[PDB]
Amino acid sequence: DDFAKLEEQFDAKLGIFALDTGTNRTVAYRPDERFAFASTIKALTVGVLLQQKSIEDLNQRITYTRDDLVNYNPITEKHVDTGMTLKELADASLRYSDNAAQNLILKQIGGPESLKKELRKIGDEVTNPEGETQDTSTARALVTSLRAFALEDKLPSEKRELLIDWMKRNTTGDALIRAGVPDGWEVADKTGAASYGTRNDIAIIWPPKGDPVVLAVLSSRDKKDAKYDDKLIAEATKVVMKALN
Ligand SMILES: *C(=O)[C@@H](NC(=O)/C(=N\OC)c1csc(N)n1)[C@@H]1N=C(C(=O)O)C(=C)CS1
């Protein structure tokens, strides 16, 4: 309704699913249409990862070299000298979206097929880490796999804590969902971006009064060197909320 108003306003396509937990209402707008997850997968990569380590294991310092650097390393290039420890890598990857840090977390849980096999294992048959479907997923499946990790029971209580934390203190999205949501309202999020003007944010939002909603906004464009505008995430979000309230 309003959603289409913004896809002509920002010349883009919007993927949207919100679900309100306490009550199950839903806001949906192209929820099953594919969009590349781009870096929002870093949230899910870490949900697996905690499945797989004690919180001591996460202290295991990790040594790497300047060859492991790719195109965005914003924390990780500060260190190839010292080294950084897996918790440190969870943090950088999620709060900063460091790509190198993702790369390493991956190579720990045994990479894209291992992660696949692991997402299939919590009910996710859409998400697709390797008319192209390689590396794309849907507003739907992303909210439902994020909820499994951070709100349901796919993690033990104390790991589930650290995820959130990492996602509350994200630095990468205050122009996006965190912008559509009033002062006083927690969001934990992980943001994405790529060419063809993909810009994504997924998130849990908590409104001082009882149960959280969980929300994915996705978008892209036309046209491969397109650039993206953040305020499309923010208004998309203001509608989802009202929509909801
Ligand atoms: C997040 O999505 C991750 N993205 C990338 O490195 C890029 N593409 O990945 C397929 C990328 C950077 S810009 C472009 N054309 N492609 C990191 N995340 C963010 C973010 O805000 O979450 C970035 C702004 C870029 S790097």
Residue numbers in the entry: 31 to 57, 59 to 83, 86 to 163, 175 to 238, 240 to 252, 254 to 291
What's the publication's text?
Here we report the crystal structure of a Class A β-lactamase PenP from Bacillus licheniformis 749/C with fluorescein conjugated at residue 166 after E166C mutation, both in apo form (PenP-E166Cf) and in covalent complex form with cefotaxime (PenP-E166Cf-cefotaxime), to illustrate its biosensing mechanism. Enzymes of this family deactivate β-lactam antibiotics by hydrolyzing the conserved β-lactam moiety in the antibiotics and rendering them ineffective to bind to their target proteins, the penicillin-binding proteins (PBPs), which are essential for bacterial cell wall synthesis and survival. For narrow-spectrum β-lactamases such as the PenP used in this study and the clinically significant TEM-1 or SHV-1 enzymes, Ω-loop is tightly packed onto the enzyme active site through hydrophobic and electrostatic interactions with residues lining the catalytic site, posing as steric hindrance for binding of second- or third-generation antibiotics with bulky side chains attached onto the β-lactam nucleus. Exploiting the proximity of Ω-loop to the antibiotic binding site and its structural flexibility, we have successfully converted a β-lactamase PenPC from Bacillus cereus 569/H into a biosensor for β-lactam antibiotics by mutating the catalytically critical residue Glu166 on the Ω-loop to cysteine and conjugating an environment-sensitive fluorescein molecule to its reactive side chain thiol group to form PenPC-E166Cf as reported in previous studies.
Cefotaxime was soaked into the PenP-E166Cf crystals by incubating the crystals in the reservoir solution with 0.01 M cefotaxime added for 20 minutes. The cefotaxime was clearly visible in fo-fc electron density map as covalently bonded through its carbonyl carbon atom C7 to the Oγ atom of Ser70, which represents the acylated ES* adduct. But we could not identify any electron density in either fo-fc or 2fo-fc map that would be accountable for fluorescein molecule around the location seen in PenP-E166Cf or anywhere nearby. Furthermore, the fo-fc map showed strong negative signal for a large segment of Ω-loop (residues 164 to 174) and the 2fo-fc map showed no electron density for this region at all, indicating this region became highly disordered upon acylation of cefotaxime. Based on these observations we did not include fluorescein molecule or the disordered region of Ω-loop in our final refined structure of PenP-E166Cf-cefotaxime. Fluorescein is seen as occupying a site that partially overlaps with the acylated cefotaxime; particularly the benzoic group of fluorescein molecule is in direct steric clash with the 7-amino substituent of cefotaxime. Thus the binding and acylation of cefotaxime to PenP would displace fluorescein from its original position to avoid steric clash. It is likely that the Ω-loop, in order to accommodate such displacement, loses its well-folded structure and becomes highly flexible.
